[PDB]
Amino acid sequence: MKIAIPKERRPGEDRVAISPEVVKKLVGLGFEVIVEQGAGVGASITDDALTAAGATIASTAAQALSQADVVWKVQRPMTAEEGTDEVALIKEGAVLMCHLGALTNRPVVEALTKRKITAYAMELMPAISRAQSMDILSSQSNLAGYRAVIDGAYEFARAFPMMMTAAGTVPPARVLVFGVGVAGLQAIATAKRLGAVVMATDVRAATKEQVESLGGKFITKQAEAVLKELVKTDIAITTALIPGKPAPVLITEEMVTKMKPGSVIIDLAVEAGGNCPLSEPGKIVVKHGVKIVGHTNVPSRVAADASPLFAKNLLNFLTPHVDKDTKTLVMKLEDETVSGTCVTRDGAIVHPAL
Amino acid sequence: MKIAIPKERRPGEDRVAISPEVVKKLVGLGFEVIVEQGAGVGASITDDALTAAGATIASTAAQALSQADVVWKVQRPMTAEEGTDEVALIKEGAVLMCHLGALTNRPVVEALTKRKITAYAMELMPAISRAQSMDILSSQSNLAGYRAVIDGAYEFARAFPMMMTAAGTVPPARVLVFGVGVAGLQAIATAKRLGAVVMATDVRAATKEQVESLGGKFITVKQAEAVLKELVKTDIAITTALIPGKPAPVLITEEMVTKMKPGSVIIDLAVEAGGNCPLSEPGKIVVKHGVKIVGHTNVPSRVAADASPLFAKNLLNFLTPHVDKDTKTLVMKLEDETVSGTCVTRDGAIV
Amino acid sequence: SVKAGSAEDAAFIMKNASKVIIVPGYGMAVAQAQHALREMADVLKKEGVEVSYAIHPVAGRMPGHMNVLLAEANVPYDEVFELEEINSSFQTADVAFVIGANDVTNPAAKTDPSSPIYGMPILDVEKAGTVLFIKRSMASGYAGVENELFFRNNTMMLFGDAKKMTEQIVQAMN
Numbered sequence A: 001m002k003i004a005i006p007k008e009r010r011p012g013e014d015r016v017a018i019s020p021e022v023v024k025k026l027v028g029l030g031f032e033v034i035v036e037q038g039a040g041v042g043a044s045i046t047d048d049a050l051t052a053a054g055a056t057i058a059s060t061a062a063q064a065l066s067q068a069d070v071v072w073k074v075q076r077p078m079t080a081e082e083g084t085d086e087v088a089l090i091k092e093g094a095v096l097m098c099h100l101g102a103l104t105n106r107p108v109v110e111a112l113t114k115r116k117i118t119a120y121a122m123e124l125m126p127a128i129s130r131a132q133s134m135d136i137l138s139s140q141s142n143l144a145g146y147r148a149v150i151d152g153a154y155e156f157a158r159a160f161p162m163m164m165t166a167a168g169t170v171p172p173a174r175v176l177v178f179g180v181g182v183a184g185l186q187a188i189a190t191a192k193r194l195g196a197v198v199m200a201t202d203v204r205a206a207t208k209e210q211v212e213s214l215g216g217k218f219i220t221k222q223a224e225a226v227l228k229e230l231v232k233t234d235i236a237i238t239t240a241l242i243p244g245k246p247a248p249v250l251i252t253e254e255m256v257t258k259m260k261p262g263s264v265i266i267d268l269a270v271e272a273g274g275n276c277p278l279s280e281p282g283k284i285v286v287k288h289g290v291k292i293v294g295h296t297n298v299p300s301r302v303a304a305d306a307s308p309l310f311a312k313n314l315l316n317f318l319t320p321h322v323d324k325d326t327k328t329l330v331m332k333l334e335d336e337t338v339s340g341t342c343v344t345r346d347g348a349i350v351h352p353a354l
Numbered sequence B: 001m002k003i004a005i006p007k008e009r010r011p012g013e014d015r016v017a018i019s020p021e022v023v024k025k026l027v028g029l030g031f032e033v034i035v036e037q038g039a040g041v042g043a044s045i046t047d048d049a050l051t052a053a054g055a056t057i058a059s060t061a062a063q064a065l066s067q068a069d070v071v072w073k074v075q076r077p078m079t080a081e082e083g084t085d086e087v088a089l090i091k092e093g094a095v096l097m098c099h100l101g102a103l104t105n106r107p108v109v110e111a112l113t114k115r116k117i118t119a120y121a122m123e124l125m126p127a128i129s130r131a132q133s134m135d136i137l138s139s140q141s142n143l144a145g146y147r148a149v150i151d152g153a154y155e156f157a158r159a160f161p162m163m164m165t166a167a168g169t170v171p172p173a174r175v176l177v178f179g180v181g182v183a184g185l186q187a188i189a190t191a192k193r194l195g196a197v198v199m200a201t202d203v204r205a206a207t208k209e210q211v212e213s214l215g216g217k218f219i220t221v222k223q224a225e226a227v228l229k230e231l232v233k234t235d236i237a238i239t240t241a242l243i244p245g246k247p248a249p250v251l252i253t254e255e256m257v258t259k260m261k262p263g264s265v266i267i268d269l270a271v272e273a274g275g276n277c278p279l280s281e282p283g284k285i286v287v288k289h290g291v292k293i294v295g296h297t298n299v300p301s302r303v304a305a306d307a308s309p310l311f312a313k314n315l316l317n318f319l320t321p322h323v324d325k326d327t328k329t330l331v332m333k334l335e336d337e338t339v340s341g342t343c344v345t346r347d348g349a350i351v
Numbered sequence C: 001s002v003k004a005g006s007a008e009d010a011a012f013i014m015k016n017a018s019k020v021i022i023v024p025g026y027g028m029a030v031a032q033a034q035h036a037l038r039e040m041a042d043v044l045k046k047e048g049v050e051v052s053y054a055i056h057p058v059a060g061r062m063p064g065h066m067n068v069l070l071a072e073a074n075v076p077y078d079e080v081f082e083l084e085e086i087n088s089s090f091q092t093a094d095v096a097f098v099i100g101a102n103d104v105t106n107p108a109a110k111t112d113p114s115s116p117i118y119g120m121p122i123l124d125v126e127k128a129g130t131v132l133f134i135k136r137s138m139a140s141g142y143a144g145v146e147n148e149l150f151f152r153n154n155t156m157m158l159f160g161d162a163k164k165m166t167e168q169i170v171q172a173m174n
């Protein structure tokens, strides 16, 4: 077949849905790999590194997509009503695989449906063991947890680790991670790596284990223990998200009141409403001496690492549906990773969203 | 007796020569502690946090320094033709203690002589074992070493540690630290605790062991070929080689930068002294050959909330020995090698 | 004068202690002996022994030298103290486990003006019942002077590599 990966046109999107390693896997499966010129610049992947891997370079997005049987993209295709009709570049009846944001972006679903594109919403990857290697949310939110701490330390005018010194004892920074997670668990680990005293909370019971496994202090009706820790906290990282519904409010404005000056909040759910009210998307707000960070698209801040993984999730999702040197792709419907993520098909939105 | 601590007025300077802790112990020595309002805001030290320790809060600079017998500042006072005349705000005959850069800033020294101010240049602290707790160079450039890795991490579009996940593995970042003083060692420490593969090199002898006492590899197998071999696979490169009052030695040249991978960065902590990389510009994140040449100015001020207490307690360790009547009168014992080794001017006379 | 010991008889001491205070120095870092040190520690805590780490200001060769290594070895911070905070507790502690540290304990700084360390505050590890020193040989530390604690009735030298010596101890503590 013919497979195409365009550059991401949306503002601030530096990731790309491919890497040189995954190119070599695709050609080996019997694919022609098309990649738009400069798509991997934000992810530190040269066009040279892709040609060397076996891929073909297209000058424009349209060209790359024109003859593409299968299309790999990071974020949803932009419609005509958004200034760049990317949907019109995909060949009719072609397959689409990307982070569609299907449930919160229905006009894009119709646009694709109207072109008879069979689009797979990668974000709905069912919660099973074999499909975690296909899971884009974990893979990417994992980097977000890491980056959430690197952003913490960058805005923090104190040091993370404890340090006994001729000039006195530099105390260890105190981190409180809201919502254990792929993201949350990765925040915990990176913070502890830096030398901070990490604490953590979440509504899920079995949390304690993985938190304590990392050597983090799981907080143990129960809410009053956080307010007692949050006041001692230097870096507060919140990661709690809800599918479709807005983000939970774990840190209110009066909570910020009780925090030390020079004390940071990384609200990773900023885009989904935020876990902190005064956290604003794409900004660093200074409130009550507390810096409230609400960066948009955090996985894009680790583009060079975020991209190659994202590409493997797709590779993992696709591979078992290739025949044996038959040079054909066919997504076995009865497979639940296919069934659960197919949002639209053959000109009809064949999914629970009437 | 009174001691005053102003707000640092130099642009970029967010440290302060005071902390809640050293106020308490200054009051116990018989001092009336006075500070300019908002002087410690840049170091996450609120005005009420000082009065909590026993400090007096003055509204302005001049309305705090005119009355002070001793003055604690982080960094040299500005003169008339430098922006704002702070030297003039100090009381005649008062004692000054801060980072002067005296042997490089003779004009601020003479400006003090005129006003008959006794000044002690904290950076000229003799390197003796007991006086390590007074050394500002060591306390401050240590946090510079920590910051460098944090900045590097920030500028890098990849993660530092190795991460195995459900969908493959990202490799660890490869770090290379040029020159191993206090800063190099702390960088290595932060880099390696972060999860990166840390390499380090230095022209010094007992460095190899010191580097190895952190988990890092000291580059030694046509010598800089071993250096090069590593520098090309490198992702982040931190340079710390600062010659005393001389220009920073060149360690990463243009053609050495061209060899580096696109996405790689260079944190140059020698910028202000010429740079360990001559392709680096002060205060600027330059980009060349797909490589970020980071050259932030005044690095410890980027860790201001932790640098200021260390600076304050440095200043306190130096002063404490010389205060007594039972406890309410300062007399710097010139006998003390720390005093004579650091005094730059006194009673309208250069020393 | 010099009282020497082994890992097998170094374990007879700390097992038969009610309170032990760990004093790590630069030699502990050179040997990368920290994972074994943490391992020796929690063996004792599981046996009821009281354990703590006395981290000295200028221990090692940089600020926080000891800290990052212990931090990496997963030593709890609630067991780590600065000179000022634990220096008096050596009274009650009956054993001082000094791993790779030397100058940091040298009383020449407290009672000898000619000493090049005179005036530097030290950890009072001569107060505890027994004083253990892990050390490859009789060589001096950074200061270049010799340490009086070495030739004392309550002091025993554990000559060897801080890593191996600590592993040997853990294995003798089985």
Ligand SMILES: NC(=O)c1ccc[n+]([C@@H]2O[C@H](COP(=O)([O-])OP(=O)(O)OC[C@H]3O[C@@H](n4cnc5c(N)ncnc54)[C@H](OP(=O)(O)O)[C@@H]3O)[C@@H](O)[C@H]2O)c1
Binding pocket: B129, C024, C025, C026, C027, C028, C030, C031, C057, C058, C059, C060, C061, C062, C063, C065, C100, C101, C102, C103, C104, C105, C134, C135, C136, C137, C138, C139, C140, C141, C142, C143, C160, C161, C162, C163
């Ligand atoms: N921390 C700082 O910021 C800094 C900066 C400058 C100077 N210093 C100085 O360095 C000293 C540091 O304190 P310290 O307590 O660590 O004293 P130290 O002077 O560093 O003593 C180190 C001891 O460890 C031993 N050692 C070295 N390698 C070893 C190994 N592989 N296994 C077992 N033992 C080993 C050495 O003797 P053997 O080789 O015979 O075993 C030596 O006696 C202080 O005097 C301080 O003034 C510190």
